[PDB]
Amino acid sequence: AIRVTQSDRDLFKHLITEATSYVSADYMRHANERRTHLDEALALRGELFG
């Protein structure tokens, strides 16, 4: 039982951590860049209006 559980725990830990890192990174960069573009657009809009 110990062997089975150890093997499966290690495998799931590894795969989950790697996949999460990989995919959340691209997601979060998309999000941050969209936010930054919005911020830049707001700055431009305010300066243009002024």
Binding site: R35, L38, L42, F49
Partner: protein
């Protein structure tokens, strides 16, 4: 037409269904558009009709009815 272009824009800027977006469908509650979502929605609406809205006049708009009213 304008009254359907508004729904198209609102939907694809919030992901909400065409049915959910009635004239009275308030964005923050009915469509769940939060601060940046509301800003982006007004941005896309300005793009759709290549027109600009005053800051206070733009923020005043918070409902599909008010949005169309200002647009038309």
């Amino acid at each position: 037409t304008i009254e359907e272009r508004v729904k198209k824009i609102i939907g694809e800027q919030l992901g909400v269904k065409q049915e959910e977006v009635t004239n009275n469908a308030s964005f923050v509650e009915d469509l769940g558009a939060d601060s940046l979502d509301t800003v982006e929605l007004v941005m896309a609406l300005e793009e759709e009709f290549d027109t600009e809205i005053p800051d206070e006049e733009a923020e005043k708009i918070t409902t599909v009815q008010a949005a169309i009213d200002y647009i038309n």
